[PDB]
Design a protein around this ligand. Structure first.
Ligand SMILES: Cc1ncc(C[n+]2csc(CCOP(=O)(O)OP(=O)(O)O)c2C)c(N)n1
Ligand SMILES: Cc1ncc(C[n+]2csc(CCOP(=O)(O)OP(=O)(O)O)c2C)c(N)n1
Ligand SMILES: O=C[C@H](O)[C@H](O)[C@H](O)COP(=O)(O)O
Ligand SMILES: O=C[C@H](O)[C@H](O)[C@H](O)COP(=O)(O)O
Ligand SMILES: [Ca+2]
Ligand SMILES: [Ca+2]
Lengths: 632, 632
């Protein structure tokens, strides 16, 4: 560790980064160049095994500014991860291992980032998950750091303030946030839009705050040493110059998100002692020094495994890594009329009791969501997490819990406020993580709180999002079967649940919940099929009885999951969907015309009133539905 | 102004509030009771005309905690607004003027609230809009205050931090935020989830901060006097007891959101000197004192109108209140190949030039959204607002600009990050305000930034949301026609625009953009119709040419707006949709099966690559589409 070697190392990172962006003719060179000194120093502090990116006690490194991806990739390559030099030359190209923003399919990447702010909240979540992991397994087995690199953009986003609020409350002294303060954003000078006292902000939220020159290697190093000893979450405010080293582009907003240009890169290389007429060059001293991470990380991981072998926590670690979902005896709700928020809360309790790594919480709505895990305690000693009124940060925190290595998290709010967390739900979907979203108060059935609290379009949003199952159970038995599927699935699930009591259904005639849609009633030479989910299934059963009394044969189909039904073969779909198919749901759900000739939904916003008065207004009654079906 | 009269007034507010919740058997009594002293005092300071709630220079009062609606309604009734005592007795009932959370259809309500945090950001927006209005009209005509009442829940939400950041930057010394600090939320003690140094937080964001007992009338009064003289945005931290006055329920989380109960209310009335055996009683002294707002507000408004009559700004105020959209000469883009982000930016420039009240901005993406209003200056002297990386607060700020009385705002970001502002977009829709949303980078056509930056489900979300038009123009001419409609509509609009160059279209054969979908190509005895929007229309035209060369008659339909097409009569729809209808869009857009037999979309997340490479991967080419259409 001297300035000559650190300068060479930083410059290696710069020029790989600049070269990759240039070859792609696409990407972000400014942040890589401005962060290269910091990352050079940090490489001396980071505990990780490049040959085993799943080591449980590794330091977790998050780049919140995912536009800095070339710098991440350069570092992974140089440190000995499975990412090659040819992969670097395929930056931002179709099917490469080096996409424009980081994806977890690239080994070494801790969490997908790209949408600003998410990373900061993910890093708090990794810090929380580490505290819980230490609670379970001991401080002899879990003692690592969480480092996050973030920029201006991250810290302007509301989710950053939400997550840092929590980091202070929970005294996350394993969390180190490094802010790249370069005074530049896409619109130019940061002062056009931001002039907060950042130190004061973060001190108000229980952080220790350091301020340094982010191009001074000894100051970077001293700050990391102090940060690692902090008794609070720590912020390093690192004043940098965007595109540091890039001559005429230093400090320019033009360096944020376009290639530096061939002549700029030649001049930069020249000034740094690099040969300007080659690219993708890795100097020898820098090669050896970065690659030393392989030997060092193998020995760190070895020492840890020896500690594990001595631990009384081995059998627990094995259960947490290999949960057995098949053994779980769920509640039997057959014939019981219940709100599905209540069936669901009973299931959450059964899960928490069977699965040592199953935990979660609500955004201040535990009592109403029915998500309290009874007699299981509060975080950190227990399992209930009190997120406060921070839907978005909750979901991003829980995305990190799902990535940590030993946890099965749930996030809960009212379905209408799913909108506050949807960007993080999207990241779960993109990553295909096991994170469960619990959304109660699913419809106009909410009643008196009125239209700001009555979902209308949210079912469409979640159905439309890739890599997500959206379950809307009609009763407790459906609610159990939705969970069985959700825990065995390869993608995240949402549970869309009622405030109000729903009527228990009879048993399936043909198919089941695993098929997405199934038959509850089947008639020969059916003239109509009524297809419904959740709270509307009983209406459809009553309506089909009235239509049969009036002389019309009907099928009734329960559709707890649209996405699973989309995967069924034509023969199955043809057996269910006979005659003229009518979809019925208390939502604005045009996607139902994939399967239905007519859809009886809600096209407007809701109304404040008693639940029964609001459903009648919106047409949800047997007499009205039957008149619709009979076109008169 | 003495303690006897203020006590009686506060208690009047309490017991109306408690009585309304009790009669409804639904609603939130805790906040009303805890805020009743503050609001009693504030009534002495508020400048407003109950008989003219549209007076432009009135103080704007926002209840961010919209669950406190009964207190708002009580105050509006007592002060002389058009809300009667019978309306109070119809709280939370279907079709009443007193819905569970406040709606702007109730005169006196400044902005709809209910989703927490929105109100705080709306109040910053009213403060910003007031500064701009003062810039335009003068400090002789605009000099009012903006008061916001908020709770724990509001200040935990990220949008609050975003909006307050801006309030400090812009030195909004017309903004007074009153925080009801009662240490209680739905999950119990606030310290379970929040322990920030609130004073330090807000000082970090450029506020002056006062701290008071919110049940001490002289302290409330002194703080309001000091706040009205502040040179910064001001926060009053008012320590209150939830359900103050309600005996055994004082300080209980159980008082947040359920009725207090008949016996509690009797004891409370008894302790306050009220007759316990009646309800909805308004004591005489309190009646006269609150109603004095009518005479006082008539004289305030009169004095203002005299100032206006003397002003050189009369003719401008009249133009701002009565814009003439019909006069506007838009750019002629016929035959010009352009990205629709670029056509759109040219239109934004034309609008800003013709409409003195048209302004807006981007969430740090002006250069990429193409939203800069050239030579029009920065806010406050000019029209370009630099929101920073604060999508949600931007939209909530702009909702308030749209409500202010003289402004036509736009908000802009990448379409993928519409998800960060969707809850405020929803409030625009609910209110039916004229607020325009500009969303560029609409598809996998984004290319290299990859799947976190490539919209897939967002078109579905916006189509599904009530009271919103979603325009996705295929060319600049469509882009102009979308604006003409948007400015004359009664609801908000979104503009979904491309990064990449689109090909100019020929003129309509039958119908036009105003019909939502129209014919570009029409063939007798058409076997197929290709229905598309935006970037996919050219693919469909090329494909229909190939299908005609292969001997199949085709129609081609451009669908710039799904919602307007849904409103067309059957005859129009039947003329367009001939044969087997195929919908084609670079989105996961199942709603297209409302009109299409087959849909050729994208069901997965995107990929990082060159735009041409990504569209080919996802099937968007003439050879692939034609093979799909021909089922082989
Ligand atoms: C939620 C969100 N909104 C907008 C963007 C587009 N974007 C990328 S970086 C950036 C701002 C510049 O940010 P900064 O963090 O200062 O990065 P630097 O250029 O200094 O590296 C923006 C607005 C995004 N990725 N995420
Ligand atoms: C965005 C959002 N998330 C959740 C809710 C549900 N909700 C209403 S009030 C409240 C919390 C209690 O808030 P506070 O502001 O402390 O109100 P108080 O009970 O003290 O009046 C919650 C979580 C909401 N209205 N908006
Ligand atoms: O503003 C949101 C409100 O607090 C809700 O009114 C309330 O918490 C819901 O109560 P319940 O569990 O009966 O639906
Ligand atoms: O992380 C988001 C990025 O900053 C975008 O890559 C960039 O700003 C887009 O540039 P362009 O105007 O060419 O699409
Ligand atoms: Ca920056
Ligand atoms: Ca509170």
């Amino acid at each position: 560790m001297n300035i000559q070697i650190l300068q060479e190392q930083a410059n290696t990172l710069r020029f790989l980064s600049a070269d990759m962006v240039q070859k792609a003719n696409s990407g972000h060179p400014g942040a890589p160049l401005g962060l290269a000194d910091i990352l050079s120093v940090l490489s001396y502090h980071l505990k990780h095994n490049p040959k085993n990116p799943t080591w449980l006690n590794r330091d977790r490194l998050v780049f919140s500014g995912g536009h800095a991806s070339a710098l991440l990739y350069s570092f992974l390559h140089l440190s000995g991860y499975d990412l090659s030099l040819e992969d670097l030359k395929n930056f931002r190209q179709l099917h490469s291992k080096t996409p424009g923003h980081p994806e977890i399919s690239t080994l070494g990447v801790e969490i997908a980032t790209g949408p600003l702010g998410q990373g900061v909240a993910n890093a708090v979540g990794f810090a929380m998950a580490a505290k819980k992991a230490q609670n379970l397994l001991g401080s002899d087995l879990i003692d690592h750091k969480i480092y996050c690199l973030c920029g201006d953009g991250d810290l302007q986003e509301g989710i950053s303030y939400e997550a840092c609020s929590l980091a202070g409350l929970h005294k996350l002294d394993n969390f180190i946030l490094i802010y790249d303060s370069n005074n530049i954003s896409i619109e130019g000078d940061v002062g056009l839009a931001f002039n907060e006292n950042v130190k004061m902000r973060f001190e108000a939220q229980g952080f220790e705050v350091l301020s340094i020159n982010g191009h001074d290697y000894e100051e970077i190093n001293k700050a990391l040493e102090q940060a690692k000893k902090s008794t609070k979450p720590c912020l390093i405010i690192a004043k940098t110059t965007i595109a540091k080293g890039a001559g005429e582009l230093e400090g320019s907003h033009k360096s944020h998100g376009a290639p530096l240009g061939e002549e700029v890169i030649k001049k930069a290389k020249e000034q740094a002692g690099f040969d300007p007429n080659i690219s993708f060059h890795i100097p020898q001293a820098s090669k050896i020094r970065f690659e030393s991470a392989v030997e060092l990380g193998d020995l760190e991981e070895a020492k840890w495994k020896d500690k594990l072998e001595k631990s009384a926590k081995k059998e627990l670690l094995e259960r947490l890594l290999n949960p057995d979902f098949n053994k779980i005896a769920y509640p039997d709700f057959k014939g019981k009329d219940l709100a599905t928020r209540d069936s669901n809360g009973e299931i959450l309790n059964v899960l928490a009791k069977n699965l040592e790594g199953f935990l979660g919480g609500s955004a201040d709505l535990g009592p109403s969501n029915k998500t309290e895990l009874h007699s299981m305690g509060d975080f950190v000693e227990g399992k209930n997490i009190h997120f406060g009124i921070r839907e978005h940060a909750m979901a991003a925190i829980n995305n990190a819990f799902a990535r940590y290595g030993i946890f099965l998290p749930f996030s809960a709010t009212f379905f209408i406020f799913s909108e506050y967390l949807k960007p993080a739900a999207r990241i779960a979907a993109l990553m295909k993580i096991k994170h469960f979203f619990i959304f109660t108060h699913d419809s106009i059935g909410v009643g008196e709180d009125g239209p700001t609290h009555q979902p209308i379009e949210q079912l469409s949003t979640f159905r439309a999002m890739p890599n997500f199952l959206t379950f809307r159970p009609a009763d407790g038995v459906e609610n159990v079967k939705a969970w069985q599927i959700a825990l065995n699935a390869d993608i995240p699930s949402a549970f869309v649940l009622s405030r109000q009591k729903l009527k228990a259904l009879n048993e399936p005639v043909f198919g089941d919940v695993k098929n997405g849609a199934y038959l509850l009633k089947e008639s020969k030479e059916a003239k109509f099929t009524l297809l419904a989910s959740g709270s509307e299934v009983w209406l459809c059963l009553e309506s089909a009885n009235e239509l049969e009394k009036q002389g019309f044969a009907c099928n009734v189909v329960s559709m707890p999951c649209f996405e699973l039904f989309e995967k069924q073969d034509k023969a199955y779909q043809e057996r269910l969907l006979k005659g003229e198919v009518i979809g019925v749901e208390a939502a604005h759900s045009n996607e139902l015309y994939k399967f239905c000739h007519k859809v009886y939904g809600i096209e407007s916003f809701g109304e404040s009133g008693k639940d029964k008065d609001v459903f009648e207004r919106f047409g949800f009654s047997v007499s009205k539905l039957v008149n619709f079906i009979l076109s008169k």
